[model samples]
Target chain A: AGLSPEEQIETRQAGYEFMGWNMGKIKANLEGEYNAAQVEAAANVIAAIANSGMGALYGPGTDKNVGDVKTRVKPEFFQNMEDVGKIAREFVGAANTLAEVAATGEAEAVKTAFGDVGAACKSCHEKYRAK
Target chain B: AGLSPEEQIETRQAGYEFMGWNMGKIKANLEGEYNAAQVEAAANVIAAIANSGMGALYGPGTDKNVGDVKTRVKPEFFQNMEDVGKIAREFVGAANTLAEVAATGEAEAVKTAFGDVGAACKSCHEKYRAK
Candidate 1:
């Protein structure tokens, strides 16, 4: 879509926020009463975003305070495109794997895959996201 | 997932917010460059959330302010489950149709489907969402 840099930043933020909410759903199931269907649904949503090429939203001039929406993406994110690409790939892969495992309805394995997905996300956030 | 009432409300709100952002992307594209790829991507995300059985998040006691997370869902929402279901199904159908149209890269068709999706959303929001 022909989104401005500011709109792009806001859209990406919304996507991430939505993913975080789904992650909380999965976490609630894991910590309280395990629900295969719910975990699968949430995992699928995460995988959809991961594979959606959302990285394109990180266009030039979108880093940090460039937009009215106020992205928490660090300036170094632009400086480390190669690393960012690698982490992004890993995130998509892990998310896809989580969706697969969740579909299996095997609780323990799904838990492990969820953790893997979380770690993959952390790998990028820890490096690129501002505190 | 075993989301509490409050958590479910928050999650559904997040999902809608994300969808709204994507809708904006499509709106921008239609008004500006009309990038097929971007419209398709944004439509797909909206379709994913629409088909994700998010209506389940409207569990009992989720209407209006119930927990720590405030909800703007009207009490009439709980009172009108049948109508809500009708609107929900219409929303999902329109979103799915939009995704299909966007995928074909037909600008005219996509624009029509996008408006249809927007109207479907508004039909529910006007009735259920608080002002």
Candidate 2:
């Protein structure tokens, strides 16, 4: 017996890819180590986020189906809500660090920190995203 | 014959004093030169602006008198619309410069530029003098 189209679309693999791309930057920047490679990676992730908006997740026909997936599989798909939680924690940490850096006139540190924080945002969206 | 209380208060001198405090900082900052002294001066000026709000300017008693002054002597009080015009021009110029500094990551330049731009705002207010 073949699995339905909805089953394939609802898999967590895509979600993991999105989250990994996002959190990678967050981790890098929060550590105060970032470079052009990180920035380029973040730009690519942001672009992916933009393109992902076109997916069936937000398309016109999937409202009820999306809702059903949200209700039934969120705990599993989001993987016990750990991915989203991690992303949030990382973001808060990053923002606090940036604020300290800005006040101290540490512009270079802030510039680097922003990249990873940006990534953390992407990761959250990949798992349990919204506008 | 005694001039009305309103007439005494509406002198250009009063406007000049107010604006002088405000614009002083703007001039200092926009010129890309300021010391701790400039910052302290600007702080005092801002305090004066705040206190002046308690005057008849926005108080309950002087509506009709205020209206008359606005009509009869604004040109005189503001004296040379150029002063007001100059303030506006300087403020806009300062904002643009600050934006450039921020984008270029020139933090110190942005800080100094902001001060003068802010002073230009005060200079105009001192002459035209309002809440």
Candidate 3:
């Protein structure tokens, strides 16, 4: 509601960090022990963050450094929000599909869905995120 | 998952920061202009983190300083896991309730649920968190 630009940057960064952590958990399960429960839980986390409507947190003037926090979001993200939003929606769709697949505890299906999720993430980062 | 103690501390801290940011969003909505959409979105974020199975992040030896990251979780938290678990479950329940109430767009109920969620967090922090 009243989030400042700096606060918005911090919040969205935290959200992304949480998602990355969950993705790591899933990767660990897939490559190391292949734990169904862990994969299910991690997939659910990714899906939730993807669908949390966090797009609002990327308010105007938050693409650059805010306070001590530096954002990796490119200015083109603001200029081309429609395309960014399309990528975001695809990400949410892929994440949700992963969650559903993970819930079934099917190892191969979860792996495929995980790949889809990663692809969706890469598509947005390729266009919107600055190196 | 195969999260190291250092990674666990970082992940849990990020989760808490995300939740705190969402709480701030809800608080701003309450104190300033109440936007139902904003509150709903924030509550969903909180609930997702609350139920995201983050307890696994606090594995053994994670309460202490790990690598360069210092955890604010108290030593007593490990000693008193049963109580900590109770508090965690309550927080999850409260957060879920807040999400449901927020979806209905009932301001009063959402406020009450938000208070409950805050209380759940405080109850854990009072005992388990280091100052």
Candidate 4:
């Protein structure tokens, strides 16, 4: 009825963009390269986004189809708030760990924490997000 | 010059924008609205941008001071790496704290942490950034 729903969809999608963009910055580091700085940058941003937290507050208008708004967030997010929260908890922890490791700017630390971050994102996306 | 000063400016400025843009998202929450969920999203995203580490690898480039590629980034940034790092640390820490407070979904915690975030940003901008 108001701008709130469209705004929510927009906000949610933008969050994903910001997170994905930062991850791309350090994609090389995760894959093979050992750019500690890149790792730090990527990890911190991801954690920030992960930490952005969720509201378990969604339903009819929160999805991509809300008014003129468009989002990749399937209705599934609100459908399974509990499950989403569970995955959210997982990603939040994983992302924070990645940021912590990368903060050290130590190659070995980032290398070690890389998989955990990727895994968390994958799990959450598969379960809740739409392609 | 090994690398142009332009590339340096671009990257540094871009980093600031990344941080600033996400910060703008939850500005209302930081002020009075006090949406814990929004708080989490904004703070965490800021952390993610900061998590993107810096490197001395890039050389200078065009688009810096050639024509319209002007910027408020003082040359002091390159010469004052120590100070920049110091301020960076403060904001990153502050941002992380905000994310943490928001994660708990405690309005009071975020309300308090919100002040710290603003102060950190102000401190850094006052010293490092140019108008």
TM-score, every prediction: 0.77, 0.24, 0.86, 0.56
Better of 1 and 2 by DockQ: 1
Off by over 4 Å in 2: A1-131, B1-79
For model 1, what share of native contacts is present?
0.51
lDDT by residue (B1-131, candidate 4, tens digit) is 23346545555555555555456656655556666666667666665565455434223343237444566655666667788778878877887787787789887777777778889878867875677
On DockQ, the candidate that comes out on top is: 3
Please give the lDDT score at residue B72 for candidate 2. 27
**Which of the two, 1 or 4, has more lDDT?**
1
TM-score of 2: 0.24
How would the docking of model 3 be graded?
A: medium
lDDT of 3 at A95: 94
Model 1, range A30-126, lDDT digits (tens) per residue? 8888888878878878987887778778988787565346888888989788999899898989999998999998888988998999998888889
Clashing pairs in 3: none
lDDT of each: 0.84, 0.43, 0.86, 0.65
Clashes found in each candidate (C-alpha, N, C closer than 3 A): 2, 9, 0, 17
Residues B19-119 of candidate 3 have per-residue lDDT tens digits of 89778878888888899987987888888788778888988878789778988988898898899888888899999999999999988888899999999
Rank candidates, DockQ, best first: 3, 1, 4, 2
Error of 1 at A68 (Å): 11
Q: Write the per-residue lDDT of candidate 3 for residues A22-63, one digit (tens) a residue.
A: 888788788877878778767877887887778888888898
What is the interface RMSD, in angstroms, for predicted model 4?
5.5
**If you assessed candidate 1 against the hidden native complex, which CAPRI class would it receive?**
acceptable
Over 4 Å off in model 3, which ranges? A32-37, B30-37
DockQ of each candidate relative to the true complex? 0.46, 0.01, 0.62, 0.24
Candidate 4: Cα lDDT at B14 = 53
Highest TM-score model number: 3
